[PDB]
């Protein structure tokens, strides 16, 4: 509920300026940030076939973008990030995924630990 | 139309021809955005094949969307990257055409058969930028990508 | 006429209207900045800007002046041009929608009456 | 379409609920300029009601126009006249919201059933300029205009 509400709000703003994108040669930082989130979120909405993910993995990936962590990442890479990131959390961060589940939502701790994982993971990815 | 429409589900692969594409002289007049295959899966035709193919459809759909817009607003509004994808979309569109052995009485060209690998390679190279310097018309009605470079040369004056 | 036709034109012309709408506002902002800088200066798809100067056409003092007058004018012009073009697209969208809905209704009716005539002739 | 067009022959009014309006937090999400009415006629609802209704409608229509300049082209070079059109319009637009008795259980706020007389007075006064000295929020989700002034004082 939490992450979805935010993404839906941001995609709706994105759909509004979406057309001006590829023709906004000189767009103001206001609408420019809306286009960046939107693409990122759109990318996170892609999913390969035959691989349905668990709700916690879903929230973790949505989190990454809806929290702006992937705003500076190049849109073409998002998909690659997502798979590598998700494999990493499924491997080394089962406890975090468990917490997100059991705790019902994203607790302050979980939110904090996510911050550390994405930011460091991203840096290695862009390395 | 009910007849064609109901036939679709009976197929494993569909090649859909378009009069609009034929009218442009693109033969075979196959619609790159409306032809499908059950086997178009990374796990069957493989990753390189799969990515290339989707990569071609994508640039072609992107172009298709800018067409109508830039035809009114002028191409000058396109950014370099955009007018870059526009250039390669048209080249890809032409490299999709091919002289058929059976169509020599119509094309006035010698038919050509291109092996899978060569098809993949050439398109992969156009998507990748490797032929931004050859004029579009070099890609029109040829076989292997190599002929695209030859024809490009051929055009001397 | 054809529903296919209208539908595509509608989709294109709706994008054109938004895009052009945006340009209007962009120019508008540029025009505001340019006009503020036009104050000090005088103390020393751009509509028809280009056409005017080129037709009548065929140191540093004046240069700055002109340039300042130029940018203001161009943005005013462009703003005007795009404002009008998005308006024209709007009207054309409205008119096309009407045509779309007349055709959609005639098509339904026409197909149905074929069915009835065939049925009745048995 | 034959369905709706046949319907409209019998409508005496339309009430339009909008997702947009809703999202501005204005509840009910009634669109003030889309909703229409046949009895909205001087010879039927009276001349006063008529002049205030139109007056609100116009202030809203103008605001809409001005909005283009406001946020985009900078809300600064607004003539003395324009400064007030925007401020009053926003208050009126907020005063058009109202707590429903039905939501009480969820919103923990007494619903306000506002008498035609109270309604006419309120909007009439905001158009007049009498309440040009109160904060917007004072006209948000209230009933009678008095409650608008009251909230203002409490908000400060």
């Amino acid at each position: 509920k939490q992450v979805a509400g935010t993404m839906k709000l941001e995609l709706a703003q994105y759909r509004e300026v979406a057309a001006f994108a590829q023709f906004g040669s000189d767009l103001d930082a206001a609408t420019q940030q809306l286009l960046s989130r939107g693409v990122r979120l759109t990318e996170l909405l892609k999913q390969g076939q035959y691989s349905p993910m668990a709700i916690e993995e879903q929230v973790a990936v949505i989190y990454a973008g809806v929290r702006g962590y992937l705003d500076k990442l190049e849109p073409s890479k998002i998909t690659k990030f997502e798979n590598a990131f998700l494999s990493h959390v499924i491997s080394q961060h089962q406890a975090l995924l468990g917490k997100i589940r059991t705790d019902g939502k994203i607790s302050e701790e979980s939110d904090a630990k996510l911050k550390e994982i994405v930011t460091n993971f991203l840096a290695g990815f862009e390395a | 139309d009910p007849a064609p429409a109901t036939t679709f589900a009976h197929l494993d692969a569909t090649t859909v021809l378009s009069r609009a594409i034929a009218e442009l002289g693109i033969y075979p007049a196959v619609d790159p955005l409306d032809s499908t295959s059950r086997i178009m899966d990374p796990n069957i035709v493989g990753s390189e094949h799969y990515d290339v193919a989707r990569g071609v459809q994508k640039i072609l759909q992107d172009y298709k969307s800018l067409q109508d817009i830039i035809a009114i607003l002028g191409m000058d509004e396109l950014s370099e990257e955009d007018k870059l994808t526009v250039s390669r979309a048209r080249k890809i569109q032409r490299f999709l055409s091919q002289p058929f052995q059976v169509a020599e009485v119509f094309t006035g060209h010698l038919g050509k058969l291109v092996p899978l690998k060569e098809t993949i390679k050439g398109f992969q190279q156009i998507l990748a930028g490797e032929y931004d310097h050859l004029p579009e018309q070099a890609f029109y009605m040829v076989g292997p990508i190599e002929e695209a470079v030859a024809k490009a040369d051929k055009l001397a004056e | 006429a054809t529903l296919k036709d209208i539908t595509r034109r509608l989709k294109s012309i709706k994008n054109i209207q938004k895009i052009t709408k945006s340009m209007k506002m962009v120019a508008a902002a540029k025009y505001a900045r340019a006009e503020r800088e036009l104050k000090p200066a005088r103390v020393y798809l751009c509509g028809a800007i280009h056409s005017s100067v080129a037709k009548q056409m065929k140191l540093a003092n004046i240069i700055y002046y002109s340039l300042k007058e130029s940018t203001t004018s161009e943005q005013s012009a462009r703003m005007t041009a795009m404002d009008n073009a998005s308006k024209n697209a709007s009207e054309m969208i409205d008119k096309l929608t009407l045509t779309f809905n007349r055709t959609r209704q005639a098509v339904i009716t026409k197909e149905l009456i074929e069915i009835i005539s065939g049925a009745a002739a048995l």
Side-chain angles (χ1 to χ4, degrees), chain A residues 10 33-42 65-68 71:
Chain A
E10 302 174 10
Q33 167 66 20
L34 292 181
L35 304 166
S36 269
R37 265 302 170 69
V39 311
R40 277 53 191 191
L41 296 175
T42 300
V66 118
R67 283 316 193 94
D71 288 3

Side-chain angles (χ1 to χ4, degrees), chain A:
Chain A
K1 253 155 182 181
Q2 180 172 23
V3 283
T6 301
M7 168 178 248
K8 168 197 196 154
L9 177 73
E10 302 174 10
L11 290 177
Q13 307 164 4
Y14 170 65
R15 279 166 256 141
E16 286 184 17
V17 181
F20 315 163
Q22 293 178 290
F23 274 84
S25 301
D26 216 323
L27 278 167
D28 52 290
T31 85
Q32 201 175 67
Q33 167 66 20
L34 292 181
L35 304 166
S36 269
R37 265 302 170 69
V39 311
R40 277 53 191 191
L41 296 175
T42 300
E43 290 293 322
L44 312 174
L45 287 180
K46 305 189 195 182
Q47 196 169 332
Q49 182 166 26
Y50 315 122
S51 62
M53 6 186 326
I55 196 71
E56 323 85 49
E57 304 154 3
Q58 290 184 57
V59 315
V61 317
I62 303 298
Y63 176 84
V66 118
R67 283 316 193 94
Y69 292 121
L70 318 180
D71 288 3
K72 287 174 213 199
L73 180 45
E74 189 186 331
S76 17
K77 282 66 209 81
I78 304 277
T79 304
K80 174 200 209 194
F81 182 86
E82 197 200 299
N83 180 231
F85 170 74
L86 189 61
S87 327
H88 178 51
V89 326
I90 288 178
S91 178
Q92 291 193 3
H93 293 102
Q94 268 300 318
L96 201 227
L97 289 170
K99 289 176 258 166
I100 296 174
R101 184 200 292 217
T102 289
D103 282 26
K105 62 184 288 161
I106 292 90
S107 68
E108 201 168 11
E109 293 182 25
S110 287
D111 205 78
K113 197 192 203 184
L114 271 171
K115 190 183 177 195
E116 276 82 75
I117 287 168
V118 189
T119 63
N120 283 315
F121 191 91
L122 217 215
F125 187 78
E126 290 209 67

